[PDB]
């Protein structure tokens, strides 16, 4: 999110990849013909001249370019039956170093692009990367885990927040929905209470949580038009149910 | 080696000696047989072959970091690695792991074991000795899970020719 | 370990002790040696090496879920896995599985065995003991398949130094 | 071989098979492993080495002959002969002796043993079987003493490769 | 186990006991040791380890269905599987196969053997016993290949502690 | 077997289980492994071979009988009957003898041993267990001598497959 | 250099990573602090980063 | 088994008994231990394990058909297969091959051996016996390479309990 | 072989004999058992099987050149190679490595060991001998780490039949 | 056990630990393995079987008593008793005897041994250790005889799992 | 086998017997145990298992032709093949190679050994014999490196039951 | 529609590629730009439906 809200709020070709190698560039260019042929078609307004803009779109990428490599740890040593994990991390060096990729628009330099690699690094660690990359990735930023109170916020304050999204998606039905504060806790604390007892997918947990919540309303919003129902403590509760640890033990443990 | 663990009064302790015995000689008598895992969330005591001890200790660390420190599970996930079509060798050693909630014992053969009502745990050569001592204590005295685990180790070191009095004990919290 | 199963009067029972013996000591004396599979459609009793016990128990669960709980077959399908050109190691243990219709015994070597006229089954160290008891009972008394399997386990625990009186029995339905 | 003796209701019976195994072959199938001593007033079943069996059995008689046939004493006096600063050969066999009043079991190493509370004794390879069986029939049925012997011998012979069903049974009116 | 086969008067028979022996005990005494293959074109008797018995029995069925029931060949084709650069483990058991034309014996080691003038075949523990009986009969009496194979089995069961009188005999046609 | 003896407060007690294990089966569960000698003034517990046990125990008596019951001396006298040109056989057993004034331990190989400062002795397979326990209860509690024995025997019988809970205890007022 | 002798010796590229930590305090608040001349000397470089980490190592896999 | 080969007077013979010995019994006493290879260009005598005998006999046939019957070479080419980085198991048996020009001996371990001045070869259990006989003959008599190899086989059969008089001899041309 | 290392006064020495013993004979009595690694930054002494000695010596050189001579680490990195899912055989030998800062011992089984307070190390057959000598010296005398390691080797060669007086000692710097 | 003795400056000392190991457990830790004989004028340290040790030790006294306590002769006369045909128990223990003038070492097989030139003797499991130590401290220091013993015993007890630190030392003014 | 090599006066010789011993018999007594490699640049003598002898002889030839006959190196390059992560089996034999400049010994385990000052080499069963002889000669006589190697072989054949007088010696140039 | 998906869940050590497909199929359910022979087509708003018997593995797998 922090890397995506750095492309629309700074205007520059973006592209996320999950570890061909140059296709990371060839595609960074195919996502630039939208801030040059959508910003100079409504700004500079025919005007065709591809041969003219085959160095107006690249002058953009060559400089304004953001590459995102999600889950990189997955390519670190430890790994003897597949040294190819260090191969990718190697064929991806020319790009962070500086080369010339041949796209279907012309030759695009990279030296000045901007790379952002994400990683959980629970298994391996920074130093478990080829020396080359360790020195061509000088910025080490440490994020933190989302807490109980952190879901209570991410649930509203942010633009396009879930509360907002379901509010508007349910208004277009002729219905109004109230998300009380004493009930945002029991929706953010009930999304955390789930990550500490199974996979901690983070925020995405919220999505799955709401979907279960609006499972009763999203279906019968038609046959119940023009109503204002309050979603509070007692409602959120008798909405989903109870989540407890499988039984793990009692199965394969003596 | 003698690793014992007693849990009483919201207290969990895991002690073990420090005699690295080789054959019938002593290579070192101060080693740490109980280490801390997950920045200090779980206690681990190993007993077995110096090598296979760690190969199974460090092998349970992975399953921990890869599972948000969910002990009771991470253990099982480790076990399952031996219960397949393609096994993981076999490890001459056993592990005693416990955190603020649970306490277990994992063998390098691939199996997990839960304590009994008294949840006391012991592994290694001088096992049952320290165990008999613990049980003896835990059942007839109001002693700290630490004091017991300490006291029980001694009894054992004084009987097992492969266990010393120089031990290291870790408790939670 | 002593696992015995008697079938009489549309009743199917499968009992086993709970002594996890290690060498000549006792690691735990309450374990469950008979579990339930397929939400409660089939009974399973294992006997062998803690590890290889499960590795073969969980290996028969697969063949059950993957075959709509068709016991008599799922078994065979499991066996076949050992009768190839590329074997499946070998498992130091045996399983006694039975549902409302059939009852069997499967070895980790790869083979399935059906009871005889009496439909009594027993595996483990104290096997034949419990077996001789069962047969003794089933043939000279009008006793519930449960009461027999219970009574038979006792006889066996009192003879096998590797079997206790603390057992767990499951019947159907 | 298999020899078992049960007693209940002023009745004492000693029965055994008749299979003389030699290695894994059978030299004979109709042997009488139980005979009467001291003017038909004592029962004696022997199991062990065809010879040593006799040699043991034969010594016990001497003793009975030397002591007005006092089952108990005779046994002890016999046992005594090994428990001396001296020593006797050390016969590879056991005997089950029993008269109107007592029931005992004597070993070649030299020691006597009384039955447990149920007054049932069994010796031989298929002993525990016959035992398990007997114990069950005694505890769960108002069956005749002689009959229990009969039924248990079979159960055992059916489980032991070294025991047949051709029996020889002597009871003490 | 005792599997013997006699061929006389355009008649081919193959009998075997039914004692599943485990160690020195008896797990079941009625099993079928002689089965029918190719809808009833060939007779097969196995002897060896319950598992490896079938792993080689079902392994010869393949080579039969894959060769229009050409016995004498299918056998050889099976053998060849062991005579390569990449072997097929090894099987603790032997097979006696015979149809209206031939009769053979195949070992899990990989080799085929043809009878001698008489045409008597026997495998398993109680082999030579039944064999000596057969030969004895076949050579000095005008007896049906069935009656002999029956009679011969008995002789063997009364000598091998690992063979019983409850056997199953199949003949052609 | 398991036999232990603790003494504190002019009290001496010797206790043992009553399981007579034979191989891995149990010939009996209610044996008395500790008895009174020399006119109820000496306690004797024996562990080892059912025979040799007695033969040892019985020799130590003759000796007590021969020396006005001087526990200590008798013991040495018996032992000194081993340290010469002549022998006395290697008796597969150990004794724990104790009277109002002393507490000793005699082995079949011929040597006496005094307890260490705590005056606690244990012999048998489950010895060190019962010991560890005892040592624990003696050092950390003002518990009755008799009670400690009672307690420790249990703890031990629960860890040793060769020791049961049916005890026999004799104390010396 | 003190960093290359206690971890991977990536060479010059080490410098880049070093400066980035140094100009981590200035590069952020250069706007709200316009037209200033600050001296980067001994005492400043020091209280700028911190100190090296000599990898646990022993702490775990060692006895 | 006893395979011997003598070469004298442009004559090359290779004889061997026919006793398929299994343990200490006889599975068949007429087998052919010397076969013909390459439509009749080379003689081959095997000795060893029924299976590994052929697995090495048929393995030398390949190297012959694949080399225009160039004995002395084909042999070596076979040997080389065992002298690599990736070996060919190991074969419990030896081969004696000879044609109108040469005569050799190849082991399943991977090596080729040439006779000595006399050109006499023998392998198997009764080897040296037949060998000593041959040498004896060849050196002190003007006998046909056939008559010798025949005569020598007999001597050996009368000494080796694993060799018979029913043999098969092949010569060239 | 006898390799010992003493560290005292900023001085680090590592000596070892030079007797290449084969069985009970001597193949060479001057070999160098202590070599220099990393142009002279670290000292290394091996003890074990001539082959497996080097296979682990040269295997630790790699981990050194590949890690700027970071002893304490390079060692661990080597160890980890044995603590995986795919092991590195096993090496019959041990290594003693030490530089101006640390000193260790690595086994071909995969484990690293640190000295105790005294920082004295010894491996090989004559280990503990030299060790006992070192400790003896280091603790009761003001002797140069070299003179000790020299003196200690002698003591050992005069006791181990597998160690000689012709040794090679390397120190730093 | 570990017993060593040094002599320098008209001083003779014999010392030993006090750990009585029984298998791998410890029956006692305060034994006195060295004593004074012949009216406190001879030092004797015994190492071996708790029994045989004494019986050897005891014989040497019967000898000293018979020969005006001439250490040397007595020892020989003792060894002499073994050194014929007339077989002697052939005790499994060794002794270190020494008085004002001499210092010897006698074995149970019957032989006497004088020290090398240094006048240091060591017997027992941790002997060589204590030896290496003593040798070192004698050659490299003007330390007290008594002291060297003290120090060597420790060094040894610290390397031997069968030797403790609770010492017993007797010197000869 | 007995292979010895002496180097004196710019002369290098390598002799070996010719007794192919199999068990305790003799398969051939004239074989060549010393061959010539690289058109006559290096001498090679093998000793070990007929097969593994060559598998290592022909394996050193490769490393020679692939390295312009650089002995001292080619050897080492061969050794390295055993000191990896993926070994080369293991070879039951040893090689003695020498040219106008050097002379070595290589084991199938993977290691190279250089002579000592005298430059005398010997391998095989009768090794040390020939060796002691050589050394004896070389040191006390002015004899040709050939005459010695010849004479030395004899001494050895007359002591080793696995060595003969019929040997083959090669020298350079 | 992704029929029989379970077939790509862990358990599977000789073929971790079953988790690879489930991985290369992430950009599609997440949101990317595929280059078709008609132009660039976004995915963020598409709709996925995956079927599975899940008798062997389970959701969490």
UniProtKB/Swiss-Prot annotation, chains B, C, D, E, F, H, I, J, K:
Signal peptide: none annotated. InterPro entries: ATP-dep_Prtase_HsIV_su, Ntn_hydrolases_N, Proteasome_sua/b, Proteasome_suB-type. SUPFAM superfamilies: N-terminal nucleophile aminohydrolases (Ntn hydrolases) (SSF56235). Its EC number is 3.4.25.2. It is found in: Cytoplasm. GO terms for molecular function: metal ion binding; threonine-type endopeptidase activity. A double ring-shaped homohexamer of HslV is capped on each side by a ring-shaped HslU homohexamer. The assembly of the HslU/HslV complex is dependent on binding of ATP. This is ATP-dependent protease subunit HslV. It comes from Haemophilus influenzae (strain ATCC 51907 / DSM 11121 / KW20 / Rd).
Curated annotation (Swiss-Prot), chain G:
It is found in: Cytoplasm. Signal peptide: none annotated. ATP binds at residue 13. ATPase subunit of a proteasome-like degradation complex; this subunit has chaperone activity. The binding of ATP and its subsequent hydrolysis by HslU are essential for unfolding of protein substrates subsequently hydrolyzed by HslV. HslU recognizes the N-terminal part of its protein substrates and unfolds these before they are guided to HslV for hydrolysis. A double ring-shaped homohexamer of HslV is capped on each side by a ring-shaped HslU homohexamer. The assembly of the HslU/HslV complex is dependent on binding of ATP. Belongs to the ClpX chaperone family. HslU subfamily. This is ATP-dependent protease ATPase subunit HslU. It comes from Haemophilus influenzae (strain ATCC 51907 / DSM 11121 / KW20 / Rd).
């Amino acid at each position: 999110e922090i890397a995506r809200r750095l492309a629309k709020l700074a205007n520059a070709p973006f592209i996320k990849v999950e570890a061909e190698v140059d296709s990371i560039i060839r595609d960074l260019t195919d996502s630039a013909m939208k801030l040059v042929r959508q910003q100079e078609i409504a700004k500079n307004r025919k005007l065709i001249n591809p041969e003219e803009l085959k160095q107006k779109a690249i002058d953009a990428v060559e400089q304004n370019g953001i590459v995102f490599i999600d889950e990189i740890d997955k390519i670190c040593k430890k790994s003897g039956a597949d040294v190819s994990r260090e191969g990718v991390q190697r064929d991806l060096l020319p790009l962070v170093e500086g080369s010339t990729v041949s796209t279907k628009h012309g030759m695009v330099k990279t030296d000045h692009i901007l790379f952002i690699a994400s990683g959980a690094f629970q298994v391996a660690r920074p130093s478990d990367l080829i020396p080359e990359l360790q020195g061509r990735l000088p910025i080490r930023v440490e994020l933190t885990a989302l807490s109980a109170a952190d879901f209570e916020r991410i649930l509203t304050e942010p633009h396009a927040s879930l509360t907002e999204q379901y509010k508007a998606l349910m208004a277009t039905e002729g219905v109004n929905i109230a998300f009380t504060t004493d009930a945002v806790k029991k929706i953010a604390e009930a999304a955390f209470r789930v990550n500490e007892k199974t996979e901690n997918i983070g925020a995405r947990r919220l999505h799955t949580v709401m979907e279960r919540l609006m499972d009763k309303i999203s279906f019968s919003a038609s046959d119940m038009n023009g109503q204002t129902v309050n979603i509070d403590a007692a409602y959120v509760a008798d909405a989903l149910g109870e989540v407890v640890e499988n039984e793990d033990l009692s199965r394969f443990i003596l | 080696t003698t690793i014992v663990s007693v849990r009483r009064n919201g207290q969990v302790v895991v002690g073990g000696d420090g005699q690295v015995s080789l054959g019938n000689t002593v290579m070192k008598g101060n080693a740490r047989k109980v280490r801390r895992l997950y920045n200090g969330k779980v206690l681990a005591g190993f007993a077995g072959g110096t090598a296979d001890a760690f190969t199974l200790f460090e092998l349970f660390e992975r399953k921990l970091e890869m599972h948000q420190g969910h002990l009771l599970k991470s253990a099982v996930e480790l076990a399952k690695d031996w219960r397949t079509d393609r096994a993981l060798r076999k490890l001459e050693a056993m592990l005693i792991v416990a955190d603020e909630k649970e306490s277990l014992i994992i063998t390098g053969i691939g199996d997990v074991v839960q304590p009994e009502e008294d949840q006391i745990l012991a592994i290694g050569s001088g096992g049952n000795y320290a165990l008999s001592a613990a049980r003896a204590l835990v059942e007839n005295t109001e002693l700290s899970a630490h004091e017991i685990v300490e006291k029980s180790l001694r009894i054992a070191g004084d009987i097992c020719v492969f266990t010393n009095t120089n031990f290291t004990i870790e408790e939670l919290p």
